[PDB]
Structure 1
Amino acid sequence: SGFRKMAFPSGKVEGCMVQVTCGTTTLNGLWLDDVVYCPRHVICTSEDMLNPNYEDLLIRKSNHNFLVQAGNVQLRVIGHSMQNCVLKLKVDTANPKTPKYKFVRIQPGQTFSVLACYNGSPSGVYQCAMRPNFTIKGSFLNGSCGSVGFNIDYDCVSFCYMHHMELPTGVHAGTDLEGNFYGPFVDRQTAQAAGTDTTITVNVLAWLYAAVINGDRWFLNRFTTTLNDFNLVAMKYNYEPLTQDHVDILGPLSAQTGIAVLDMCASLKELLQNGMNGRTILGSALLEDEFTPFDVVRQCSGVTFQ
């Protein structure tokens, strides 16, 4: 029992983190086999930040302008190329700690672990979710760029996020590992703002199912709803629309608890109307939306506490 924001163990990713320096700029890179991936803005200077021409900046660099340090060892850069917003530095050594891995581009609402790093060294690990407005609510300081987000279902690391920037509201933006940004953002310091964010409805429903699995039913009610009526109400509270795909994904939790998905939707409607009246759910006084259905199944018992 219990329910925590649980990250994946970070060791398989720690062994891939390196420091990349170009000029006076230092950030983190990800060393997989004989390639180091890092944000391309490592090649910018101070006069470059608003409208950098990355193709023009990069042609002026040789391999030896990039200093890559793995722990105490310098790696030798033997080639470089840019793919979208990431730089790929070919190095002369394959990383002996490379885990089994893949690159995946995730959808809003998906969660992942972040290993926050500075100067190629890990500082901590935490869970994040891709918000509907394609930002993440991270914890990142100067020098954290190139830190990555990942999942490790089974034995394989799926890298899904590379950190590039902080927006004015204090939230964060970055790319997949092919260098395409999530959302409409660009790696320029021109004025950019995140869109209005919404709550991830399917994740709130998953977390209510987690609460039932762990033994709490106080928030259920005798009512049901149609999917259409639920979405009409949910939108009034800035909740994302719930689709038939989301209803299907909740199937296993519904089966384990005996609570039909649209009955849990009626419970959520009432919670939005009433608040918690001084109670908590899984230790929270707010409705939590950064656990996915898959996260709940990963963490919770397969036996409900009836």
Structure 2
Amino acid sequence: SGFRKMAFPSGKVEGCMVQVTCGTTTLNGLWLDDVVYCPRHVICTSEDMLNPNYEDLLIRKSNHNFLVQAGNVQLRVIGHSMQNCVLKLKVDTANPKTPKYKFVRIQPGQTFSVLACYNGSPSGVYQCAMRPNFTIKGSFLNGSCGSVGFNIDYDCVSFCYMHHMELPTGVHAGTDLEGNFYGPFVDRQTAQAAGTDTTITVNVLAWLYAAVINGDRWFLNRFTTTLNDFNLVAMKYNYEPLTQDHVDILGPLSAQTGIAVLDMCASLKELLQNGMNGRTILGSALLEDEFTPFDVVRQCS
């Protein structure tokens, strides 16, 4: 037993990380088969970022403006193209360490592991969630651009995130691996800001279940609520609404514990309206919303 913020084992992704240099800018790239993926702003100057025309900047570049190094061995760039906001660097060698992989776009509320990298070298791994406002609260220093987020199913790596930038609020924004940004964010120097964030209600419920599974029951109560009456209270607290789909997804946790979802909802309603009163759940004094129902099942069984 126990409950921890748990990332996926990162080995399969470490074998794909490379260093990509263009001009005086170095950042990370993802090397799968004979393609290297990286943020397209790798070709930009600080002057360019104020109003880049990326198709114009990239056309003024040649393959030899791109230095790719997989550890020591330099990779020869034999061709380059743009896919939305990622750059695709064709290289002569297929990565022998290429895992089975897919490119998947995730939904707000879903979680993924991040392998933070610098100069193509992995430095740490952590779990986070796509916030409802399409930012992630990551840990990223200058040079981490190109670090990826991923899930693992069986032996297959679903890449879902490439890191592009930090917003002025200290949160982070990037794209899926097809180069499409999560959220209304752009790879240009503008006055971008994250919208209003909300709490991921279905995840808070999953985490209350995880607590019950782990012997924390002080917050449980005898009451039950209706979906509508729950939503009417939670939205007052900037909680995402809960759907019948959410209730279905929470089914297996409801079964393992024998507590109906709407029963648990009454607990969460009570916790929202009363606070926690110096008590903790699973070692936390706040309601935790970055564990999905699947993460709980995974870890608690």
TM range (shorter): over 0.9
Please report how far the alpha carbon of residue 142 of structure 1 lies from its aligned counterpart in structure 2 after TM superposition. 0.5
Post-superposition Cα deviations, 1:13-59, rounded to whole Å, max 9, x if no partner, equal 00000000111111100000000000000000121011100001000
For 1:272 and 1:226, the matched residues in 2 are separated by: 16
For 1:97 and 1:218, the matched residues in 2 are separated by: 48
Gaps of 5+ in 1: 302-306
For 2:190 and 2:276, the matched residues in 1 are separated by: 42
Matches within 5 A, 1:1-306: 1-301=1-301
Please report how far the alpha carbon of residue 228 of structure 1 lies from its aligned counterpart in structure 2 after TM superposition. 0.6
For 1:68 and 1:17, the matched residues in 2 are separated by: 11
SS of 1:236's equivalent?
A: helix
For 1:281 and 1:292, the matched residues in 2 are separated by: 16
Please report how far the alpha carbon of residue 81 of structure 1 lies from its aligned counterpart in structure 2 after TM superposition. 0.5
For 1:264 and 1:77, the matched residues in 2 are separated by: 55
TM-score when scaled to structure 2?
0.99
SS of 2:165's equivalent?
A: strand
Post-superposition Cα deviations, 1:231-269, rounded to whole Å, max 9, x if no partner, equal 010011110011111111001100110000001000000
Gaps of 5+ in 2: none
Post-superposition Cα deviations, 1:137-174, rounded to whole Å, max 9, x if no partner, equal 00001110000000112111000000001001000000
For 1:145 and 1:201, the matched residues in 2 are separated by: 30
Please report how far the alpha carbon of residue 224 of structure 1 lies from its aligned counterpart in structure 2 after TM superposition. 0.7
SS of 2:69's equivalent?
A: strand
Post-superposition Cα deviations, 1:45-89, rounded to whole Å, max 9, x if no partner, equal 121011100001000111111000000010000011000000000
For 2:280 and 2:35, the matched residues in 1 are separated by: 47
SS of 2:19's equivalent?
A: strand
For 2:243 and 2:50, the matched residues in 1 are separated by: 40
User: What's the Cα RMSD here?
Assistant: 0.6
Post-superposition Cα deviations, 1:195-241, rounded to whole Å, max 9, x if no partner, equal 00000000000000000111121111111111011001001111001
Please report how far the alpha carbon of residue 277 of structure 1 lies from its aligned counterpart in structure 2 after TM superposition. 1.5
> What number of residue pairs does the alignment pair up?
301
For 1:218 and 1:46, the matched residues in 2 are separated by: 54
Q: Percent identity?
A: 100
> Which of structure 1's runs of 4+ aligned residues deviate more than 2 A?
none
Please report how far the alpha carbon of residue 279 of structure 1 lies from its aligned counterpart in structure 2 after TM superposition. 1.3
For 1:46 and 1:112, the matched residues in 2 are separated by: 31
For 1:252 and 1:156, the matched residues in 2 are separated by: 24
